[model samples]
Target: MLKTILSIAGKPGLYKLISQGKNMLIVETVDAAKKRVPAYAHDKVISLADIAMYTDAEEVPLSEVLEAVKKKENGAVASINYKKASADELHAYFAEVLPNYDRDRVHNGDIKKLISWYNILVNNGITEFVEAPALEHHHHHH
Candidate 1:
């Protein structure tokens, strides 16, 4: 579900993938503008579905992380104001969502960005944070 949404480097907000061109991509901003723009290969386009969070044991996908936030806020914007949140404040709030998040790797700034992103997603009503399961394929090993 999150795969269709994208994040472009140097861009302020998320984007919805509309269609593809030979050398560029057409995207609509996920904000008030909803402006359509073209992104070239050098634009550093990244899919929200491909992003993941680091844990001590395994990497957790952004989809799961976002879903956790949704559950915590009951499908609303994040309670904390990231703009004024202190490092400790951000860390403490993130702990409630993913206790095992790598403390050192996941910097306070990242947490702040995460909170903002969550609020944006919630506000835009793009709350489907989990990807649907793929078609089952049987595999057997001898």
Candidate 2:
């Protein structure tokens, strides 16, 4: 499932926000051992929820597109040379995964990163997404 987890600019890895303090915030890394650290306001923290890819048509949320990739992969790993996939190959794959992805705006590098990030989350078992809102029953006048 998708959470707005992230890696701040200049940081080395993915992190999950824990609690905010007076001036610093605590975050737990995506490692198996779970490394906790203090992230200050100066850190360029960008949430996954805030990321999107540009198509000539519009900017689509990254999570929605990433979900497509996950489903395409059968909830398993993304098998590709994300860092080095050929432009044509990556493009073909992206089309297969996101049929409407902007061909002109989305370049090979972006696809590589999308695939890499997807693999990273899957490899870490961080694939659970948030559920939609539902309602509790309440009696109404007939």
Candidate 3:
């Protein structure tokens, strides 16, 4: 069996997780309903820490995590490659990036800036962000 995790917030979103030879996990947010987007899971490998962070913080639902991918903003969906991350790495990623997220008050320009900074920090070669499985290779080795 193979699995992945995802997160959904803001309005309502719908997402699906699919793999070549695995049962898919589908999640629909009643608060907001949108089109069902498909996400791929190459293997069962997923970032346990990443899943825990979202669930523990109540930022997203467990069902969303089980689905392996999540959608937000009613149109944008994030397809996380969990097999590329570890618990610690995932946690660190959130810690480093999430602090910049202010759910209560959001600005699109600020969001873009934050995302740019996060990408520079997390995706840059200077840091270990790329070391996490989620950010690593697309295919799952395990």
Candidate 1: tens digits of C-alpha lDDT, residues 1-142 = 6567886544455778889999778888787678888777665577777777776756767656666655666665778877777878887887786687776867535666566567677666664553321222222220
What is the RMSD, in Å, between candidate 2 and the native fold over all Cα?
7.3
Task: Order the numbered candidates by lDDT, best leading.
Answer: 1, 2, 3
Reference-based TM-score of each model: 0.71, 0.66, 0.20
Taken over the whole model, the C-alpha lDDT of each candidate is 0.67, 0.62, 0.30
Error (Å) of candidate 2 at residue 16 is 0.8
Worst 10 residues of 1 by lDDT: 133-142
The sequence of per-residue lDDT tens digits that candidate 3 reaches over residues 49-141 is 233212223464222222222122121222222335554444343334344334343322322222322322222221122223433333222
**Best prediction by lDDT:** 1
The local lDDT score (0 to 100) that residue 131 gets in candidate 3 is 20
Q: Give the C-alpha miss distance for residue 98 in model 3, angstroms.
A: 2.2
* TM-score for predicted model 2 compared with the true structure: 0.66
lDDT of 1 at 9: 48
lDDT-superior candidate, 1 or 2: 1
**Steric clash count of candidate 2:** 4
